[PDB]
Design an enzyme around this catalytic site. Structure first.
Site, short mmCIF file in Angstrom:
data_model
loop_
_atom_site.label_atom_id
_atom_site.label_comp_id
_atom_site.label_asym_id
_atom_site.label_seq_id
_atom_site.Cartn_x
_atom_site.Cartn_y
_atom_site.Cartn_z
N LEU B 17 0.80 -1.21 0.00
CA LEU B 17 0.00 0.00 0.00
C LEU B 17 0.84 1.27 0.00
O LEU B 17 0.40 2.30 -0.49
CB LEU B 17 -0.92 0.02 1.21
CG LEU B 17 -1.89 -1.16 1.30
CD1 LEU B 17 -2.73 -1.05 2.56
CD2 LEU B 17 -2.76 -1.18 0.05
N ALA B 21 9.52 6.70 4.45
CA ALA B 21 10.78 6.76 5.18
C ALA B 21 10.63 5.89 6.41
O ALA B 21 11.56 5.19 6.82
CB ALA B 21 11.09 8.20 5.57
N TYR B 22 9.44 5.93 6.99
CA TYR B 22 9.14 5.16 8.19
C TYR B 22 9.25 3.65 7.95
O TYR B 22 9.69 2.91 8.83
CB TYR B 22 7.73 5.52 8.68
CG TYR B 22 6.61 5.03 7.78
CD1 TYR B 22 6.14 3.72 7.87
CD2 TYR B 22 6.03 5.88 6.83
CE1 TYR B 22 5.12 3.25 7.04
CE2 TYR B 22 5.01 5.42 5.98
CZ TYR B 22 4.57 4.10 6.10
OH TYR B 22 3.57 3.63 5.27
N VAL B 24 7.19 0.33 5.49
CA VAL B 24 6.14 -0.02 4.53
C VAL B 24 4.85 -0.48 5.17
O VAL B 24 4.85 -0.90 6.32
CB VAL B 24 6.60 -1.15 3.57
CG1 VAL B 24 7.79 -0.68 2.76
CG2 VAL B 24 6.97 -2.38 4.37
N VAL B 25 3.77 -0.41 4.41
CA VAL B 25 2.46 -0.84 4.88
C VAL B 25 1.78 -1.66 3.78
O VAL B 25 1.78 -1.29 2.61
CB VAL B 25 1.58 0.37 5.30
CG1 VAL B 25 1.34 1.29 4.13
CG2 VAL B 25 0.27 -0.14 5.88
N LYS B 40 1.69 -2.43 9.17
CA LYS B 40 2.85 -1.55 8.99
C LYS B 40 4.11 -2.21 9.50
O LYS B 40 4.16 -2.67 10.65
CB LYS B 40 2.71 -0.26 9.81
CG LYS B 40 1.86 0.82 9.25
CD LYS B 40 2.25 2.12 9.94
CE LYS B 40 1.41 3.29 9.51
NZ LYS B 40 1.79 4.49 10.31
N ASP B 135 0.43 18.68 13.55
CA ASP B 135 0.80 18.53 12.13
C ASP B 135 -0.38 18.10 11.29
O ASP B 135 -0.26 17.25 10.42
CB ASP B 135 1.94 17.53 11.96
CG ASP B 135 2.58 17.59 10.53
OD1 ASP B 135 2.49 18.65 9.85
OD2 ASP B 135 3.18 16.58 10.11
MG MG Z 1 11.22 1.86 8.73
#
Ligand code: MG
EC number: 2.7.11.24
Lengths: 19, 335
Positions: B17, B21-22, B24-25, B40, B135
């Site tokens: 999906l 940077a974090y 993948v999902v 995630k 944010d």
């Molecule tokens: Mg990561």
């Protein structure tokens, strides 16, 4: 039980009338 | 291309999906029940900033049980601290987000009311719980085909009582100009920018840099100049900086939003106010005439105050090590 899995890569309705 | 998830054999990955940077999902099917979820996969331990943002996100989603805040179903419990390198979060799968919706859908005034109403309902329970998002933007408001809207991305959140942002297009002017970067009012400003974007179908203040951002803002709400206009800015250096900019009187919003519902324009005027103390609150916005179709004072959760210690790490200035970050997430997962 945890196993490894691999994966390879590559309509909004109308809003409700009344609450 | 080759994505590996080391997760329960009860899940079967469906499709990729997103890749950020974090991490993948992916969407996945929980075999036993056929239920679909989003999973995630995060590898935050070599990326400090993301480990801390992931920690805030987990704590907040686990805490709330609200219709307008993303639901987390579970977090994989690792078997050893030593080989703890990935974090798997199982959460509800949302179809799209408001950014994508504003870019592709023809929205009616009713759609707009409904989306801003749900956004503010989430902000009310957060603010009432002493949580400020900090944010908010269209891409953080997830949406499903029936128009349900849920807030996510609490990476910059704080508990009330420098940093990096992807964009400042939705940031309040006083936040940019002063040390007052942790108010409930900054979230209402962002909501005002989102409401404006719903009407215009494009961001209302797309600054090219710091100075230009203020120039665009003031070019619409008016450049604060008088001692009264500036009374809210405590810092003399900030007031001098503001005074050094081109100065213009406020622009008439009706001219800018000609075919918009007058009540929507009034609500927007109350949100896009320079003085944070004069900015409408989430609770008051919910009671505003523009949202009367969806307002129900008996069904808009007020929240319960969360103590500052909830984010204790925010009150210590000793350098954090890779191991310290792993321990913070580990402890949260198991408690
Ligand atoms: Mg990561």
């Amino acid at each position: 039980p945890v196993e490894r899995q691999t994966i390879y890569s590559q309509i909004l309705a109308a809003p409700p009338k009344e609450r | 291309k080759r994505i590996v998830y080391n997760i329960s054999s009860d899940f079967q990955l469906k499709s990729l999906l997103g890749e950020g940077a974090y991490g993948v999902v992916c969407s996945a099917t929980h075999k036993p029940t056929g239920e679909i979820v989003a999973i995630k996969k995060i590898e935050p331990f070599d990326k400090p900033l993301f480990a801390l943002r992931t920690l805030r996100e987990i704590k907040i989603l686990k805490h709330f049980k609200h219709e307008n805040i993303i639901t987390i179903f579970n977090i994989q419990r690792p078997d050893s601290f030593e080989n703890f390198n990935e974090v798997y979060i199982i959460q509800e799968l949302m179809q799209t987000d408001l950014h994508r919706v504003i870019s592709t859908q023809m929205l009616s005034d009713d759609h707009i009311q409904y989306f801003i109403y749900q956004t503010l309902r989430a902000v009310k329970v957060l603010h009432g719980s002493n949580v400020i998002h900090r944010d908010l933007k269209p891409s953080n408001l997830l949406i499903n085909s029936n128009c349900d809207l849920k807030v996510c991305d609490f990476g910059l959140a704080r508990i009330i009582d420098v940093e990096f942002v992807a964009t400042r297009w939705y940031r309040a002017p006083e936040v940019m100009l002063t040390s007052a970067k942790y108010s409930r009012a900054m979230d209402v400003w962002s909501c005002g920018c989102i409401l404006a974007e719903l009407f215009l179908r494009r961001p209302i203040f797309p600054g090219r840099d710091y100075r230009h951002q203020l120039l665009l803002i003031f070019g619409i709400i008016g450049t604060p100049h008088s001692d009264n206009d500036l009374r809210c800015i405590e810092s003399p250096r900030a007031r001098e900086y503001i005074k050094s900019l081109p100065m213009y009187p406020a622009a008439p919003l009706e001219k800018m939003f000609p075919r918009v519902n007058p009540k929507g324009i009034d609500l927007l005027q109350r949100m896009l106010v320079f003085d944070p103390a004069k900015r409408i609150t989430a609770k008051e916005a919910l009671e505003h005439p523009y949202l009367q179709t969806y307002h129900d004072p008996n069904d808009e959760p007020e929240g319960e105050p969360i103590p500052p210690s909830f984010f204790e790490f925010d009150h210590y200035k000793e350098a954090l090590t890779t191991k310290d970050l792993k321990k913070l997430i580990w402890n949260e997962i198991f408690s």
